[PDB]
């Protein structure tokens, strides 16, 4: 796997960000994580949704560098979103959300599962520390 440069366009939700990638605007969905959402009238603004969303927003907004890392399998989903690990100054946003108890590890689809172990390890720690979602 390799990281590539991208430029923030707009943070959209805890688990979705819009980036400039290879000169085209594109919506990215964060691989392997489920955050509570703000956007979906199914329930509306779930609990910790505003919080997960504020966290991803600040993280990508205050970064000097954003990089995207595609996994080994398909790189877009049925809605046309890029499927990727997102990095803000070297730190994986997907991991940080999970480390903070602001996201769970999603259902995993091989072969898009390279960082699955790492994330599950952070999730176990957040649970143990009873952070946010695990409170």
Swiss-Prot record:
The active site is at residues 29, 37, 81. It comes from the Bacteria. It is found in: Secreted. Residues 115-135 are annotated as: Disordered. Residues 115-131 have a biased composition (Basic and acidic residues). Transmembrane segments: none annotated. Ca(2+) binds at residues 15, 34-35. This is Nuclease A.
């Amino acid at each position: 796997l390799h990281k590539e440069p991208a430029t923030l366009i707009k943070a959209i939700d805890g688990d979705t960000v819009k980036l400039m990638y290879k000169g085209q605007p594109m919506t990215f969905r964060l691989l392997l994580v489920d955050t509570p959402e703000t956007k979906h009238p199914k329930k509306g603004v779930e609990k910790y949704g505003p919080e997960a969303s504020a966290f991803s927003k600040k993280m990508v907004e205050n970064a000097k560098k954003i990089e995207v890392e595609f996994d080994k399998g398909q790189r877009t989903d049925k809605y046309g979103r890029g499927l990727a690990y997102i990095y803000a100054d070297g730190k994986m946003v997907n991991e940080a959300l999970v480390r903070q108890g602001l996201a769970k590890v999603a259902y995993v689809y091989k072969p898009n599962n390279t960082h699955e172990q790492h994330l599950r390890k952070s999730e176990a720690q957040a649970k143990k520390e009873k952070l946010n979602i695990w409170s």
